[PDB]
Amino acid sequence: TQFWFWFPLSHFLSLAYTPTCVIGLNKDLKMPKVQYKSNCKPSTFAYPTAKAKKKEKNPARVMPAQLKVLTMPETCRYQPFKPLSIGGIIILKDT
Amino acid sequence: AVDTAEQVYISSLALLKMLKHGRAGVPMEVMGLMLGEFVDDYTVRVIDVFAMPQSGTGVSVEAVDPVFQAKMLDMLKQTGRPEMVVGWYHSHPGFGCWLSGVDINTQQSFEALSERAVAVVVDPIQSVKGKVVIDAFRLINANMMVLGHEPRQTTSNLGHLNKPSIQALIHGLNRHYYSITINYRKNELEQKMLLNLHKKSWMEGLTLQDYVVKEMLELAKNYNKAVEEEDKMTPEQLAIKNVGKQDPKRHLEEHVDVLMTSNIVQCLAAMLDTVVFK
Amino acid sequence: DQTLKMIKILSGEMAIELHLQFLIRNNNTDLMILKNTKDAVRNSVCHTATVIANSFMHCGTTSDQFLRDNLEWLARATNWAKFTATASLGVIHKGHEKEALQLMATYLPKDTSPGSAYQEGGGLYALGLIHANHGGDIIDYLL
Ligand SMILES: [Zn+2]
């Protein structure tokens, strides 16, 4: 907040950063084969098609509000069981 | 070396001695000194400001008699506690401020002698109770011109000191100068007692001696007839038609608060018999 | 084992390096606008603004460019931009937890220069950015 009074107080907000991304990882490094989508626009996705595309966990960047508008892959081999409404970690099942 | 925003804590006695010494210093632009303590680079508290004798030649450093200082401060040695002379002051007692040539007479002398060497410009005119009319600065070296003159580690106070949009001849002389912050430090034991002795002296009545009660109401019913008919004659001529004209002349008639407060005074001062008596 | 799991969960490396992996694979930023404001040279606090603006897009990327492409504008300001410039190495390489200490094995506070004590202050400041919010055994060694 008050940063004139000591100029290196201007660094501390950089320590308050969380990446807007999701972890659908099952085993600690085991990369999935999961690419599920959202029913949104491509331009709401566009950050300087209608469906969203994941990246098989590194995690994938997203709007925080673009996580309550997804749809689970009912045709995937690896289906998540814990509901993923927002970023963080959930469990997946190796089926 | 490195530069950080210098702060002038003032003794309030210094404020009093500046106003008094420049008040007596009627137009003739007196000289006096500043006698203080070296705490650091970025602050200074001044603790004592005394008087210097009037010289009618020209406001100079050569009028500063050092044995006058020796004798006066010698009397002040066992009296309280002496310190270093840390500066000086001249006066422009009618107009606001400017950076004098007296500055470039004595400022090199006192930055040779002393280190902080704060110039001080004063005026008493601009108010009587609510302003900070004194002004203070400090000469800059010519040797720092290789450095670009924009570091400052706490730029709130330069965002408060540049903020008054500096007036005329200061930034007529931004060169050979660099400004300095002057707050009024914590002086609350005096602040509360002059508040007391301002609404106990500087507002009349020493409170045993107020409780004019009647002849003021003779004059006030003169008021409350003479003001009243003029409050009557005007709003007859308000917009009694259906015009959409939009150009007012403004006089704001109303005359309410005179009636209100004066007659609260009249009723609670007619109370004085039943109040002070039984 | 779950014995090895309770060894490793309070360490907590995997979130840090997935963050690091995410940012080194996800540099969806721009250096052109950084040039369009890099050109705006003034001796004041603007140096800190530039290095913190590219630290914001490299805190956890292990990647520097304005600690690389210059030394004169890098050493233009004095005694505070040096604090901030060696602090930006700790901001950018926050999320490089164990290995950033040997990344600053060259940049110890007393290796580079005993002239600026703020340079050697920003050094251990950056080691506090190495141990930002989740330290380890070297909390006590910084102590
Ligand atoms: Zn004067």
Q: How far is the CA of B114 from the centre of ligand 1 (A)?
A: 21
B12: nearest Cα among B132, B202, B187, B182 = B187
Q: Which residues of B touch C80 (CB under 8 A)?
A: 151, 153
SS3 B216: helix
Q: How far is CA C106 from CA C69, C109, C112, in A?
A: 19, 9, 8
Taking the Cβ of residue B156 and every Cβ of chain A, the question of whether any pair is shorter than 8 Å is answered with yes
Q: Which residues of C touch B151 (CB under 8 A)?
A: 43-44, 77-78, 80
Parallel/antiparallel/unpaired status of strands B119-121 and B181-184: unpaired
Q: How far is CA B243 from CA B239, B246, B247, C126, in A?
A: 7, 9, 11, 74
Eight-class DSSP state of C140: H
Chain C: nearest CA to B151, how far in angstroms?
5
Compute the distance between CA of residue A37 and CA of residue C41 in angstroms, rounded to an integer: 45
B90 annotated to bind ligand: yes
Q: How many CB atoms lie within 10 A of CB C59?
A: 24
Contacts of B181 (CB under 8 A, 6+ apart): B5, B6, B7, B8, B157, B160, B161
Looking at the DSSP bridge assignments, the partners of residue A60 are A22
Q: Which residues of A touch C80 (CB under 8 A)?
A: 7
Read off φ and ψ for residue A27, nearest 5 degrees: -105, 150
Token look-up 């106003």 returns B19
Q: How far is the CA of B65 from the centre of ligand 1 (A)?
A: 19
Residue type, B30: V
CB B44 within 8 A of CB B182: no
Estimate to the nearest angstrom the gap between the alpha carbon of C79 and the chain centroid: 18
Read off φ and ψ for residue B17, nearest 5 degrees: -70, -30
CB C24 within 8 A of CB C61: yes
Q: Which helix (H) or strand (E) holds B43?
A: strand B43-48
Hey, what are A34's tokens? 């999961």
Eight-class DSSP state of A7: G
Compute the distance between CA of residue B17 and CA of residue B9 in angstroms, rounded to an integer: 15
Residue type, C99: E
Compute the distance between CA of residue B163 and CA of residue C15 in angstroms, rounded to an integer: 47
Taking the Cβ of residue C79 and every Cβ of chain B, the question of whether any pair is shorter than 8 Å is answered with yes
Parallel/antiparallel/unpaired status of strands B135-138 and B178-179: antiparallel
Compute the distance between CA of residue B168 and CA of residue C109 in angstroms, rounded to an integer: 47
Contacts of B159 (CB under 8 A, 6+ apart): A4
Compute the distance between CA of residue C59 and CA of residue C64 in angstroms, rounded to an integer: 10
Of B2, B151, B153, the CB nearest to C43: B151
B198 annotated to bind ligand: no
Longest dimension (CA), chain C: 58
Method: cryo-EM
Compute the distance between CA of residue B40 and CA of residue B114 in angstroms, rounded to an integer: 14
B56: nearest Cα among B29, B87, B93 = B29
Q: B43, B153, B162: best mutation site toward chain A, by most A Cβ within 10 Å?
A: B153
Q: How many CB atoms lie within 10 A of CB B211?
A: 12
Angle, helix B215-233 to helix B257-270, in steps of 10 degrees:
150
Angle C3-A59-C135 (CA atoms, 0-180°, nearest 5)? 50
Compute the distance between CA of residue C56 and CA of residue B113 in angstroms, rounded to an integer: 49
Parallel/antiparallel/unpaired status of strands A70-71 and A37-38: antiparallel
Token look-up 């109770």 returns B129
Which residues make up the environment of ion ligand 1, defined by Cβ < 5 Å?
Answer: B 29, 90-92
The alpha helices in chain A, defined as continuous H runs, are 42-45
CB C81 within 8 A of CB C48: yes
- The resolution in angstroms reads 4.2
The subunits that touch chain A, with at least 3 C-beta pairs less than 8 Å apart, are B, C
Contacts of B125 (CB under 8 A, 6+ apart): B93, B94, B95, B96, B133
Estimate to the nearest angstrom the gap between the alpha carbon of B109 and the chain centroid: 28
CB A89 within 8 A of CB A25: yes
Compute the distance between CA of residue C117 and CA of residue B151 in angstroms, rounded to an integer: 18
SS3 B69: helix
Compute the distance between CA of residue B91 and CA of residue B72 in angstroms, rounded to an integer: 22
CB B4 within 8 A of CB B154: yes
Q: Is B122 exposed, middle or buried (0-12, 13-18, 19+ CB in 10 A)?
A: buried
SS3 B257: helix
Interchain proximity C78–B151, CB inside 8 Å: yes
Q: DSSP string spanning B79-133?
A: SS---EEEEEE----SS-----TTHHHHHHHHHHHSSS-BEEE--STT-SSS---
CB C79 within 8 A of CB A8: no
Sheet of strand B84-89: strand arrangement: B84-89, B32-36, B43-48, B7-10, B181-184
Of C42, C43, C80, the CB nearest to B153: C80
CB B59 within 8 A of CB B102: yes
Chain A: nearest CA to B168, how far in angstroms?
28
